[PDB]
Amino acid sequence: PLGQTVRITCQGDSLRTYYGNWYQQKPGQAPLLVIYAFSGSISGNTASLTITGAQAEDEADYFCNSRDTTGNLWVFGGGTKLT
Amino acid sequence: PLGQTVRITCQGDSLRTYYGNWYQQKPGQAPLLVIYAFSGSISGNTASLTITGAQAEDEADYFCNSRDTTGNLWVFGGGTKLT
Amino acid sequence: PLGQTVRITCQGDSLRTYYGNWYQQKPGQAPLLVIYAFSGSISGNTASLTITGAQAEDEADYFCNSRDTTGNLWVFGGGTKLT
Amino acid sequence: PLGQTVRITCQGDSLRTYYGNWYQQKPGQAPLLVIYAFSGSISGNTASLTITGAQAEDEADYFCNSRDTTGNLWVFGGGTKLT
Amino acid sequence: PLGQTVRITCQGDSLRTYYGNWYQQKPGQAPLLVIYAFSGSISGNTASLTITGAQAEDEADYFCNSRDTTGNLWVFGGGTKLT
Amino acid sequence: PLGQTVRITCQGDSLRTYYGNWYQQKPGQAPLLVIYAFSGSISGNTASLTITGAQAEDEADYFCNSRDTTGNLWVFGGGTKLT
């Protein structure tokens, strides 16, 4: 029995608040599963931002708090009652 | 029994609030599953933003909190009562 | 028994609030499953935005909180009562 | 029984508050699973930001606090009652 | 029984507050699992930032406090009651 | 029984507050698991920052305080009641 498991809960950036400009170049997010085997530019853009009044009375955030049961072959997830 | 499992709950950015300009270049999000085997530009754009009054009394956020049961071959998910 | 499983709950960006301009170049979101085997531009656009009064008394958000049972061959999902 | 497990709860940056400009080049986030085996530029952009009034009375944040049960072959997750 | 386990709770930077400009070049975040086996530039960008009024009465942050049970072969996670 | 375990709770920088400019070059964060076996530049950028009023009455931070049970072969995590 051979198996190759990759569990990633978030491949990304996790924020409660972002004010401003975000220049982002993230070419690859592609899982390549193989059993037998970027000149992109962000250029000359103008970004003008002004936040004068902001009130954020927010409640709690729950990001990437997983409860999974992952693997290969026999996987029993959650409150599996087995007899 | 061979198997190759990739479980990703979010491949993306997770935010409660974003104010502003987002320049984003994310070419690849394609899982390639193979058993036997970008000159794009964002350029010269003008972005003018002004938020004067903002009130955000928001409630809680639950992002990417999975409960899955993933794998290959035998997978029993949730409260599977087995006898 | 061989099998190749990719489970992705979100391939995308997950937000409660976005105010502003979003320049987005995401060429590929295509799962390619093969057993035997972008000069696009966003340019010169003008974006003028002004939010003066905003009140957002919102309730809770539940994003990408999956409960799936995924795999190959034998998959028993949810509260499968088996005897 | 051979197996190769990679569990990553967050591959990304985790913040409660970000004010400002973010130049980000993150080419690779692609798990490559193989049993037998970037000239991109952010250039000349202008970013003008001003936050005058900000009040953020926010509640608690729970980022990347996973409860998973990951692996290969036999995986029993959560409060599995086994007899 | 051979197995190779890598458990990383955060591969990223974890902050409660960030004010300013972030130039970031992080090419590789790709777990490569193999059983048998960057000229990118951020250049000439102008970043102007001014935060005059900021009040942040925030609540507690819980970052990367995992409770997982990870490994290869037999993995029993959480309060598994076994008899 | 052979196994090779790497448990890293944070591969990243952990801060409560950051004011200023961050030039960051972190090429590699990729766990390479193999059983049988960067000319990037940040150059000429201008960063202007001014924080005049800042008040941060924040609550406690809990960063990288894990409770995991990691390994290879037999792993029993949390308050596993075994008989």
Numbering used by the authors:
A (entry chain C), B (entry chain B), C (entry chain A), D (entry chain D), E (entry chain E), F (entry chain F): 13 to 49, 61 to 106
Publication passage describing the model:
These segments extend roughly from residue 10 to residue 50 and from position 60 to position 110 and harbour the fibril cross-β structure.
The second patient (FOR010) also showed major cardiac involvement and fibrils were purified from the cardiac tissue which became available to us due to heart transplantation. In the case of the FOR010 fibril protein, it was not possible to determine the sequence of the precursor LC by cDNA sequencing and its amino acid sequence as well as its posttranslational modifications (PTMs) were determined here at the protein level using MS. Comparison of the mutant patients’ sequences with the non-mutated GL segments led to the identification of six amino acid changes in the fibril proteins of patients FOR005 and FOR103, and fourteen in the fibril protein from patient FOR010. The dominant fibril morphology from each sample was structurally reconstructed to a spatial resolution of 2.92 Å (FOR103) and 2.25 Å (FOR010), based on the 0.143 Fourier-shell correlation (FSC) criterion. The swirl is defined by the position of the central arc of the amyloid key relative to the N- and C-terminal ends of the polypeptide chain. The swirl of the key is right-handed in the FOR005 and FOR103 fibril proteins when oriented as shown in Fig. 3b, and left-handed in the FOR010 fibril protein. This mutation (H96L) affects a buried position of the FOR010 fibril, where it replaces a charged residue with a hydrophobic one.
